[PDB]
Design a binder for this molecule. Structure first.
Ligand SMILES: O=S(=O)(O)c1cc2c(O)c(c1)Sc1cc(S(=O)(=O)O)cc(c1O)Sc1cc(S(=O)(=O)O)cc(c1O)Sc1cc(S(=O)(=O)O)cc(c1O)S2
Ligand code: HEC
Ligand SMILES: [Zn+2]
Length: 107
């Protein structure tokens, strides 16, 4: 579960752990993973022009800071069968920092 962290640290975590597959900007393209602009408050599997797995659409999670933290702890345990091949951020502070950044950077 989420507590406010450091967006500055979260930016560095994004650059090293997520940027490979994702962009955050309004104008950012889908890559291996979908662009994440507007992710919070949208249901999973809803970015236009991206081909999601059945598993991601089926989860139908309304993304918020708390379920994002559970997801990022271990994506495959939260959405078994997702094609996001990322083992997770096991340190709670890392998830808090990353999500603090993501809440701002995807607006
Ligand atoms: O809201 S934010 O959480 O993002 C946030 C923004 C700013 C800010 O001061 C703070 C928190 S408070 C703060 C938090 C943390 S910590 O919690 O992350 O440890 C460490 C520090 C720190 O002062 S020290 C520090 C570390 C680094 S770094 O090591 O190179 O990243 C760069 C700068 C810097 O001062 S310079 C620097 C560069 C930029 S930028 O836009 O050019 O990236 C913006 C700012 C800068 O100060 S404003
Ligand atoms: C490539 C090796 C990736 C890494 C590194 C990261 N993500 Fe990812 N992500 C990737 C794919 C292929 C997908 C689609 C999964 C599917 O099953 O269809 C995703 C999906 C997400 C989502 C959900 C998006 C949505 O429902 O619209 C989120 C919120 C997400 N990814 C976040 C995220 C974070 C925060 C990352 C760094 C910790 C990260 N991803 C890395 C591919 C890859
Ligand atoms: Zn400062």
């Amino acid at each position: 579960e989420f507590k406010a962290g450091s967006a500055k640290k979260g930016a560095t975590l994004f650059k090293t752990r997520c940027l490979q597959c994702h962009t955050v900007e309004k104008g950012g393209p889908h890559k291996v993973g979908p662009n994440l602009h507007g992710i919070f408050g949208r249901h999973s599997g809803q970015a236009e022009g991206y081909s999601y797995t059945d598993a991601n659409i089926k989860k139908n999670v309304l993304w918020d800071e708390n379920n994002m933290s559970e997801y990022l702890t271990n994506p495959k345990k939260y959405i078994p069968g997702t094609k996001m091949a990322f083992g997770g951020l096991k340190k709670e502070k890392d998830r808090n920092d990353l999500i603090t950044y993501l809440k701002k950077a995807t607006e």
